[PDB]
Amino acid sequence: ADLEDNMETLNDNLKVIEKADNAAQVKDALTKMRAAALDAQKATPPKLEDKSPDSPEMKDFRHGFDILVGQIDDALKLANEGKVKEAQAAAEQLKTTRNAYHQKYR
Ligand code: HEM
Secondary structure (H helix, E strand, O other): OOHHHHHHHHHHHHHHHHHOOOHHHHHHHHHHHHHHHHHHOOOOOHHHOOOOOOOHHHHHHHHHHHHHHHHHHHHHHHHHOOOHHHHHHHHOHHHHHHHHHHHHHO
16 A cells, blocks of 8 residues: 555544444554554655665654554553553554654655
């Protein structure tokens, strides 16, 4: 999928997690976010199109998805342990990462 479509998928699932009633809904949503983040990681964002693919900026852009995947893994862990509300609260941290990386590259 392209970068924009993967961003919509992340947004779609963040909202599902916020309104979720059970662990399956939260687990499934985090699972789809993780796959979209990994798909997005291979893209070149518009703002960095004139930089080399291996530049410090492109490496930082890719690192933003490694942070996001780590945060999703932490929330997935809690949801799998039946700590649903804790997983939903943990998922809010993804917004900090979104905000910091959007600030830089969106
Ligand atoms: C849960 C985390 C995130 C959410 C919910 C999110 C959501 C979005 C949304 C809704 C858009 C608008 C475009 C569209 O999808 O139609 C967007 C754009 C974008 N996001 Fe994210 N994002 C997240 C994390 C990140 C991270 C971590 C990065 C960088 C590592 C990033 C980089 C970008 C870029 C570069 C654009 C602009 C793409 C373009 O103009 O084609 N996003 N994001």
